[PDB]
Protein backbone atom coordinates (compact mmCIF):
# COMPACT_ATOMS: atom_id res chain seq x y z
CA UNK A 1 0.00 0.00 0.00
CA UNK A 2 0.44 3.64 -0.95
CA UNK A 3 2.63 5.66 2.55
CA UNK A 4 5.20 8.37 2.71
CA UNK A 5 6.97 8.23 6.44
CA UNK A 6 9.22 10.95 7.79
CA UNK A 7 11.99 11.28 10.32
CA UNK A 8 11.05 12.10 14.15
CA UNK A 9 11.59 15.57 15.59
CA UNK A 10 14.44 17.51 15.35
CA UNK A 11 15.64 20.05 17.99
CA UNK A 12 18.88 21.94 16.72
CA UNK A 13 20.16 25.19 17.85
CA UNK A 14 20.53 28.33 15.33
CA UNK A 15 23.35 27.96 13.01
CA UNK A 16 22.99 24.37 12.94
CA UNK A 17 21.70 22.42 9.99
CA UNK A 18 19.13 19.48 9.64
CA UNK A 19 18.10 16.84 6.96
CA UNK A 20 14.35 15.57 6.72
CA UNK A 21 13.88 12.52 5.20
CA UNK A 22 10.71 11.31 3.45
CA UNK A 23 10.26 7.58 2.62
CA UNK A 24 7.77 6.89 0.02
CA UNK A 25 6.89 2.84 -0.45
CA UNK A 26 3.82 0.96 -2.04
CA UNK A 27 4.77 2.77 -5.70
CA UNK A 28 7.34 4.11 -7.39
CA UNK A 29 9.38 6.79 -6.43
CA UNK A 30 10.20 8.09 -10.08
CA UNK A 31 6.94 8.65 -11.25
CA UNK A 32 5.21 10.88 -9.45
CA UNK A 33 6.53 14.30 -8.06
CA UNK A 34 7.54 14.85 -4.23
CA UNK A 35 6.79 18.64 -3.07
CA UNK A 36 7.51 19.47 0.27
CA UNK A 37 5.49 21.89 2.81
CA UNK A 38 5.72 23.91 5.60
CA UNK A 39 3.67 24.90 8.39
CA UNK A 40 5.14 27.02 11.46
CA UNK A 41 3.01 26.67 14.97
CA UNK A 42 -0.40 28.06 14.54
CA UNK A 43 -0.06 29.23 11.13
CA UNK A 44 -1.88 27.72 7.42
CA UNK A 45 0.57 25.76 4.67
CA UNK A 46 3.78 26.92 3.12
CA UNK A 47 4.56 25.35 0.01
CA UNK A 48 7.59 25.11 -0.58
CA UNK A 49 8.34 23.88 -3.99
CA UNK A 50 8.77 20.17 -5.13
CA UNK A 51 11.78 17.79 -6.40
CA UNK A 52 11.37 15.62 -9.70
CA UNK A 53 12.15 12.49 -8.69
CA UNK A 54 12.59 12.05 -12.46
CA UNK A 55 15.78 14.06 -12.82
CA UNK A 56 16.54 14.88 -9.75
CA UNK A 57 16.22 18.63 -10.29
CA UNK A 58 14.68 20.78 -7.69
CA UNK A 59 12.86 23.64 -8.33
CA UNK A 60 12.69 26.08 -4.68
CA UNK A 61 9.88 29.03 -3.80
CA UNK A 62 11.32 32.13 -3.93
CA UNK A 63 12.81 32.78 -0.49
CA UNK A 64 13.15 29.25 -0.31
CA UNK A 65 15.54 29.04 -3.24
CA UNK A 66 18.53 29.89 -0.19
CA UNK A 67 19.55 28.26 2.45
CA UNK A 68 16.96 25.03 1.96
CA UNK A 69 17.90 21.91 -0.34
CA UNK A 70 16.12 19.19 -1.59
CA UNK A 71 17.82 16.08 -2.59
CA UNK A 72 16.83 12.22 -3.73
CA UNK A 73 17.88 8.62 -3.34
CA UNK A 74 16.33 6.41 -6.19
CA UNK A 75 17.99 3.24 -4.72
CA UNK A 76 16.75 3.81 -0.96
CA UNK A 77 13.23 5.17 -2.62
CA UNK A 78 13.93 8.50 0.02
CA UNK A 79 13.32 12.30 -0.84
CA UNK A 80 15.43 14.79 1.49
CA UNK A 81 15.27 18.05 2.89
CA UNK A 82 18.45 19.61 4.09
CA UNK A 83 18.15 22.80 5.88
CA UNK A 84 21.03 24.95 6.79
CA UNK A 85 22.17 28.06 8.92
CA UNK A 86 19.01 27.23 10.99
CA UNK A 87 17.27 29.63 12.56
CA UNK A 88 14.28 30.60 15.43
CA UNK A 89 11.74 31.32 12.56
CA UNK A 90 12.44 27.79 11.10
CA UNK A 91 10.50 26.03 14.33
CA UNK A 92 7.71 24.19 12.20
CA UNK A 93 6.71 21.00 10.71
CA UNK A 94 7.73 20.16 7.24
CA UNK A 95 5.18 17.15 4.98
CA UNK A 96 6.16 15.84 2.20
CA UNK A 97 3.48 14.82 -0.41
CA UNK A 98 3.22 12.84 -4.08
CA UNK A 99 2.00 14.67 -6.63
CA UNK A 100 -0.99 12.29 -8.46
CA UNK A 101 -1.26 14.97 -10.78
CA UNK A 102 -5.05 15.50 -10.81
CA UNK A 103 -5.34 14.03 -7.28
CA UNK A 104 -3.14 16.34 -4.84
CA UNK A 105 -1.29 15.77 -2.91
CA UNK A 106 -3.27 13.00 -2.05
CA UNK A 107 -0.61 10.93 0.06
CA UNK A 108 1.27 13.27 2.64
CA UNK A 109 4.03 12.12 5.43
CA UNK A 110 2.91 11.95 9.18
CA UNK A 111 5.30 15.59 8.87
CA UNK A 112 8.51 16.52 10.93
CA UNK A 113 9.19 18.48 13.48
CA UNK A 114 11.82 20.71 13.55
CA UNK A 115 12.43 22.84 16.51
CA UNK A 116 15.18 25.17 16.44
CA UNK A 117 15.64 27.04 19.99
CA UNK A 118 18.21 28.64 21.72
CA UNK A 119 17.73 26.93 24.99
CA UNK A 120 20.10 24.11 25.88
CA UNK A 121 17.97 20.60 27.13
CA UNK A 122 17.12 21.31 30.70
CA UNK A 123 15.62 18.65 33.47
CA UNK A 124 12.60 19.89 35.19
CA UNK A 125 12.46 21.43 38.73
CA UNK A 126 10.00 19.71 40.31
CA UNK A 127 8.40 21.44 43.36
CA UNK A 128 4.97 20.43 45.22
CA UNK A 129 1.78 21.88 45.82
CA UNK A 130 0.21 21.46 48.97
CA UNK A 131 -3.26 20.42 49.69
CA UNK A 132 -5.99 23.01 49.06
CA UNK A 133 -9.67 22.64 49.87
CA UNK A 134 -11.28 25.73 48.49
CA UNK A 135 -11.90 25.35 45.05
CA UNK A 136 -13.22 21.63 45.30
CA UNK A 137 -16.16 20.35 46.88
CA UNK A 138 -17.13 17.15 48.82
CA UNK A 139 -14.73 17.52 51.49
CA UNK A 140 -12.01 16.79 48.97
CA UNK A 141 -8.50 18.29 48.29
CA UNK A 142 -6.49 19.39 45.68
CA UNK A 143 -2.88 18.61 45.73
CA UNK A 144 -0.17 18.54 42.58
CA UNK A 145 3.08 19.08 41.15
CA UNK A 146 5.14 22.05 39.67
CA UNK A 147 7.11 20.56 37.32
CA UNK A 148 9.47 24.07 36.70
CA UNK A 149 11.57 25.11 33.54
CA UNK A 150 12.18 21.83 31.41
CA UNK A 151 13.34 21.84 27.76
CA UNK A 152 12.60 20.55 25.21
CA UNK A 153 8.79 18.54 25.26
CA UNK A 154 7.17 16.07 26.57
CA UNK A 155 6.76 15.58 30.35
CA UNK A 156 5.72 12.44 31.71
CA UNK A 157 3.88 12.91 34.87
CA UNK A 158 2.07 9.78 36.98
CA UNK A 159 0.78 9.45 40.63
CA UNK A 160 1.62 7.23 42.89
CA UNK A 161 3.29 5.27 40.25
CA UNK A 162 0.62 4.69 38.04
CA UNK A 163 -1.65 3.26 40.88
CA UNK A 164 -3.71 6.59 41.29
CA UNK A 165 -5.40 7.72 38.24
CA UNK A 166 -9.28 8.61 38.88
CA UNK A 167 -9.10 13.05 39.87
CA UNK A 168 -5.92 13.28 37.80
CA UNK A 169 -5.56 16.49 35.83
CA UNK A 170 -2.42 17.18 33.70
CA UNK A 171 -2.72 20.39 32.31
CA UNK A 172 -0.51 20.94 29.21
CA UNK A 173 2.69 23.25 29.11
CA UNK A 174 2.89 26.65 29.02
CA UNK A 175 6.07 27.85 27.01
CA UNK A 176 7.32 30.90 28.57
CA UNK A 177 9.48 33.80 26.88
CA UNK A 178 12.76 31.64 27.98
CA UNK A 179 12.30 29.61 26.42
CA UNK A 180 11.39 26.95 28.66
CA UNK A 181 8.12 24.54 29.50
CA UNK A 182 6.19 24.59 32.85
CA UNK A 183 3.37 22.63 33.63
CA UNK A 184 1.55 21.72 36.72
CA UNK A 185 -0.40 18.54 37.69
CA UNK A 186 -3.25 18.15 40.48
CA UNK A 187 -5.04 14.97 41.51
CA UNK A 188 -7.98 15.11 43.47
CA UNK A 189 -8.28 13.16 46.85
CA UNK A 190 -10.39 13.00 49.54
CA UNK A 191 -9.71 15.05 52.72
CA UNK A 192 -9.72 11.53 54.96
CA UNK A 193 -6.89 10.41 53.65
CA UNK A 194 -4.03 13.07 54.26
CA UNK A 195 -2.32 12.52 55.91
CA UNK A 196 -2.41 8.84 56.32
CA UNK A 197 -2.16 8.34 53.15
CA UNK A 198 0.92 8.83 51.23
CA UNK A 199 1.17 10.48 47.54
CA UNK A 200 4.30 10.91 45.43
CA UNK A 201 4.61 12.91 42.35
CA UNK A 202 5.92 10.51 39.77
CA UNK A 203 7.55 12.98 37.08
CA UNK A 204 9.25 11.15 34.02
CA UNK A 205 11.70 13.57 31.12
CA UNK A 206 13.63 11.63 28.77
CA UNK A 207 15.00 14.44 26.78
CA UNK A 208 17.22 14.91 30.08
CA UNK A 209 16.88 11.71 31.10
CA UNK A 210 15.87 12.98 34.74
CA UNK A 211 12.91 11.04 36.95
CA UNK A 212 11.58 12.17 39.88
CA UNK A 213 9.65 10.97 43.04
CA UNK A 214 8.72 14.21 44.61
CA UNK A 215 5.91 13.22 47.86
CA UNK A 216 3.04 15.98 48.57
CA UNK A 217 2.89 16.71 52.47
CA UNK A 218 -0.01 18.55 53.49
CA UNK A 219 1.12 21.84 55.48
CA UNK A 220 2.85 23.31 57.93
CA UNK B 1 -2.30 33.69 -1.45
CA UNK B 2 -5.48 32.55 -1.73
CA UNK B 3 -8.93 33.84 0.20
CA UNK B 4 -10.98 32.22 2.49
CA UNK B 5 -12.66 33.12 5.05
CA UNK B 6 -11.10 33.22 8.61
CA UNK B 7 -13.48 31.44 10.44
CA UNK B 8 -17.18 29.29 9.68
CA UNK B 9 -19.76 27.87 12.47
CA UNK B 10 -22.91 25.97 12.42
CA UNK B 11 -24.80 23.82 14.35
CA UNK B 12 -25.35 19.69 13.95
CA UNK B 13 -27.75 18.96 11.32
CA UNK B 14 -26.58 22.53 9.51
CA UNK B 15 -25.33 23.05 6.24
CA UNK B 16 -22.48 24.43 5.96
CA UNK B 17 -20.09 25.99 2.92
CA UNK B 18 -16.63 27.92 2.89
CA UNK B 19 -15.55 30.00 0.24
CA UNK B 20 -12.67 29.87 -1.93
CA UNK B 21 -11.86 32.84 -4.48
CA UNK B 22 -7.93 34.72 -12.36
CA UNK B 23 -4.01 33.49 -12.59
CA UNK B 24 -5.63 30.39 -10.49
CA UNK B 25 -9.34 22.88 -7.05
CA UNK B 26 -8.51 20.36 -4.40
CA UNK B 27 -9.80 20.80 -0.77
CA UNK B 28 -7.68 19.23 2.12
CA UNK B 29 -9.11 18.53 5.96
CA UNK B 30 -6.79 18.75 8.71
CA UNK B 31 -7.64 17.65 12.12
CA UNK B 32 -5.54 19.12 14.94
CA UNK B 33 -1.52 18.06 15.53
CA UNK B 34 -1.65 15.62 12.45
CA UNK B 35 -1.16 16.12 9.01
CA UNK B 36 -3.33 16.99 5.94
CA UNK B 37 -5.89 14.84 4.04
CA UNK B 38 -7.03 14.92 0.61
CA UNK B 39 -10.76 16.40 1.13
CA UNK B 40 -11.98 17.07 -2.46
CA UNK B 41 -10.12 16.34 -5.92
CA UNK B 42 -11.28 17.90 -9.24
CA UNK B 43 -13.34 19.80 -7.42
CA UNK B 44 -16.56 17.82 -7.95
CA UNK B 45 -14.70 14.17 -6.34
CA UNK B 46 -14.00 12.41 -2.88
CA UNK B 47 -11.55 9.71 -2.55
CA UNK B 48 -12.57 6.47 -0.32
CA UNK B 49 -13.11 7.27 3.02
CA UNK B 50 -14.94 10.25 2.49
CA UNK B 51 -18.55 11.03 3.91
CA UNK B 52 -21.45 12.23 1.31
CA UNK B 53 -21.54 15.42 3.32
CA UNK B 54 -18.53 16.82 1.61
CA UNK B 55 -19.42 18.20 -1.69
CA UNK B 56 -17.24 20.57 -3.29
CA UNK B 57 -18.41 23.24 -6.00
CA UNK B 58 -16.52 24.77 -9.31
CA UNK B 59 -17.90 28.45 -10.48
CA UNK B 60 -15.09 29.35 -12.95
CA UNK B 61 -14.79 32.67 -10.94
CA UNK B 62 -14.08 30.93 -7.55
CA UNK B 63 -14.56 27.43 -5.74
CA UNK B 64 -16.63 26.52 -2.93
CA UNK B 65 -16.09 23.37 -0.18
CA UNK B 66 -20.35 22.62 1.07
CA UNK B 67 -20.72 20.49 4.39
CA UNK B 68 -24.27 19.43 4.28
CA UNK B 69 -25.46 18.09 8.00
CA UNK B 70 -22.30 18.88 9.91
CA UNK B 71 -21.09 16.40 12.34
CA UNK B 72 -18.96 16.97 15.48
CA UNK B 73 -15.46 15.03 14.17
CA UNK B 74 -15.60 17.89 11.56
CA UNK B 75 -14.53 20.27 13.36
CA UNK B 76 -10.91 21.06 12.01
CA UNK B 77 -9.02 22.94 9.75
CA UNK B 78 -10.10 23.38 5.76
CA UNK B 79 -7.47 23.94 3.43
CA UNK B 80 -8.46 25.01 -0.61
CA UNK B 81 -5.36 24.35 -3.30
CA UNK B 82 -5.91 25.15 -6.74
CA UNK B 83 -3.19 26.37 -9.31
CA UNK B 84 1.67 27.89 -13.08
CA UNK B 85 2.74 26.34 -9.39
CA UNK B 86 0.92 24.77 -6.65
CA UNK B 87 -0.99 27.65 -4.62
CA UNK B 88 -2.61 27.46 -0.94
CA UNK B 89 -5.80 29.34 0.03
CA UNK B 90 -5.03 30.12 3.52
CA UNK B 91 -6.69 29.00 6.72
CA UNK B 92 -10.35 28.71 7.95
CA UNK B 93 -11.26 27.67 11.05
CA UNK B 94 -14.43 25.40 11.47
CA UNK B 95 -16.04 25.13 14.99
CA UNK B 96 -19.27 23.48 15.79
CA UNK B 97 -21.93 25.40 17.51
CA UNK B 98 -22.96 23.08 19.76
CA UNK B 99 -22.94 22.46 23.84
CA UNK B 100 -23.74 25.29 26.34
CA UNK B 101 -21.42 27.75 28.03
CA UNK B 102 -19.63 26.69 31.31
CA UNK B 103 -18.17 28.43 34.08
CA UNK B 104 -14.68 28.09 34.69
CA UNK B 105 -13.44 26.66 38.11
CA UNK B 106 -10.19 28.34 39.31
CA UNK B 107 -7.42 27.06 41.50
CA UNK B 108 -4.70 28.83 42.71
CA UNK B 109 -1.47 27.41 44.83
CA UNK B 110 1.05 30.05 46.15
CA UNK B 111 4.78 28.74 45.96
CA UNK B 112 5.96 25.63 48.63
CA UNK B 113 8.49 26.44 51.08
CA UNK B 114 10.79 24.58 49.28
CA UNK B 115 10.36 26.79 45.97
CA UNK B 116 11.33 29.84 48.14
CA UNK B 117 14.01 27.60 50.13
CA UNK B 118 15.66 27.70 46.74
CA UNK B 119 15.85 31.49 46.18
CA UNK B 120 12.78 30.99 43.80
CA UNK B 121 8.90 31.78 43.77
CA UNK B 122 5.82 30.77 41.67
CA UNK B 123 1.83 31.58 41.80
CA UNK B 124 0.03 29.05 39.95
CA UNK B 125 -3.48 29.53 38.77
CA UNK B 126 -5.23 26.73 37.14
CA UNK B 127 -8.58 26.77 35.55
CA UNK B 128 -10.73 24.13 34.25
CA UNK B 129 -13.75 23.12 32.69
CA UNK B 130 -14.99 26.45 30.94
CA UNK B 131 -16.54 26.97 27.12
CA UNK B 132 -15.99 28.45 25.08
CA UNK B 133 -12.40 28.51 24.88
CA UNK B 134 -11.95 32.21 25.60
CA UNK B 135 -10.79 33.53 28.82
CA UNK B 136 -8.70 36.71 29.80
CA UNK B 137 -6.35 36.22 33.25
CA UNK B 138 -5.16 39.10 35.10
CA UNK B 139 -2.67 39.45 38.11
CA UNK B 140 -3.08 41.26 41.13
CA UNK B 141 -0.32 42.54 43.88
CA UNK B 142 -2.29 43.64 46.40
CA UNK B 143 -5.38 45.11 44.42
CA UNK B 144 -2.48 46.59 41.92
CA UNK B 145 -2.33 44.87 38.73
CA UNK B 146 0.58 42.99 37.83
CA UNK B 147 2.01 41.95 34.09
CA UNK B 148 5.78 41.82 34.18
CA UNK B 149 6.66 37.57 35.10
CA UNK B 150 3.19 36.66 33.46
CA UNK B 151 2.60 33.50 31.86
CA UNK B 152 -0.14 31.96 30.34
CA UNK B 153 -1.31 29.31 27.77
CA UNK B 154 -3.96 29.53 25.27
CA UNK B 155 -6.62 27.13 26.51
CA UNK B 156 -7.13 23.61 25.11
CA UNK B 157 -9.89 21.15 24.87
CA UNK B 158 -10.02 18.65 27.77
CA UNK B 159 -11.40 15.16 27.93
CA UNK B 160 -14.72 15.98 28.54
CA UNK B 161 -14.99 18.53 25.41
CA UNK B 162 -14.66 21.86 27.83
CA UNK B 163 -11.73 23.90 27.85
CA UNK B 164 -8.47 24.16 30.38
CA UNK B 165 -5.77 26.88 30.71
CA UNK B 166 -2.99 27.54 33.46
CA UNK B 167 -1.51 30.76 34.29
CA UNK B 168 2.05 31.06 35.93
CA UNK B 169 3.12 34.21 38.04
CA UNK B 170 7.06 33.71 38.71
CA UNK B 171 8.58 35.94 41.70
CA UNK B 172 11.38 36.97 43.65
CA UNK B 173 11.02 35.42 47.35
CA UNK B 174 11.18 39.19 48.37
CA UNK B 175 8.44 40.31 46.25
CA UNK B 176 6.14 37.30 47.37
CA UNK B 177 6.69 38.11 51.14
CA UNK B 178 6.55 42.41 50.96
CA UNK B 179 2.93 41.97 49.61
CA UNK B 180 0.04 41.16 51.99
CA UNK B 181 -1.53 39.29 48.97
CA UNK B 182 -1.26 38.04 45.38
CA UNK B 183 -4.62 37.29 43.21
CA UNK B 184 -5.41 35.38 39.79
CA UNK B 185 -8.52 36.84 38.10
CA UNK B 186 -10.23 35.24 35.86
CA UNK B 187 -12.89 36.07 33.10
CA UNK B 188 -14.78 34.05 31.29
CA UNK B 189 -18.27 35.41 29.11
CA UNK B 190 -19.01 38.65 31.22
CA UNK B 191 -17.89 36.93 34.44
CA UNK B 192 -15.24 36.75 37.01
CA UNK B 193 -13.96 35.06 39.33
CA UNK B 194 -10.15 36.05 41.70
CA UNK B 195 -8.78 33.62 43.62
CA UNK B 196 -6.70 35.18 46.29
CA UNK B 197 -3.37 33.87 48.35
CA UNK B 198 -1.25 35.33 51.13
CA UNK B 199 2.57 34.76 52.46
CA UNK B 200 1.45 34.84 55.85
CA UNK B 201 -1.20 32.01 54.68
Known amino acids: QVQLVQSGSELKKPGASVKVSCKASGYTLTRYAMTWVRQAPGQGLEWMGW????????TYVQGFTGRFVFSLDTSVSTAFLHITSLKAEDTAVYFC???????????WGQGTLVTVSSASTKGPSVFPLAPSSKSTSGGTAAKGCLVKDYFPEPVTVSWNSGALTSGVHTFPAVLQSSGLYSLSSVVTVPSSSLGTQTYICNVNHKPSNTKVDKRVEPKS | VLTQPPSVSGAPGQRVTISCT???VHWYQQLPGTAPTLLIY???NRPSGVPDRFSGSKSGTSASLAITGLQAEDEADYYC???????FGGGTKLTVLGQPLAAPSVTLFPPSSEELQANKATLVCLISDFYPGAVTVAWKADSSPVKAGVETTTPSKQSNNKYAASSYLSLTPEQWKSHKSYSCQVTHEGSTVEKTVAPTE
Open chain 1, 97 to 107: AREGGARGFDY
Open chain 2, 22 to 24: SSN
Open chain 2, 42 to 44: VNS
Open chain 2, 81 to 87: QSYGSAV
Open chain 1, 51 to 58: INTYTGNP
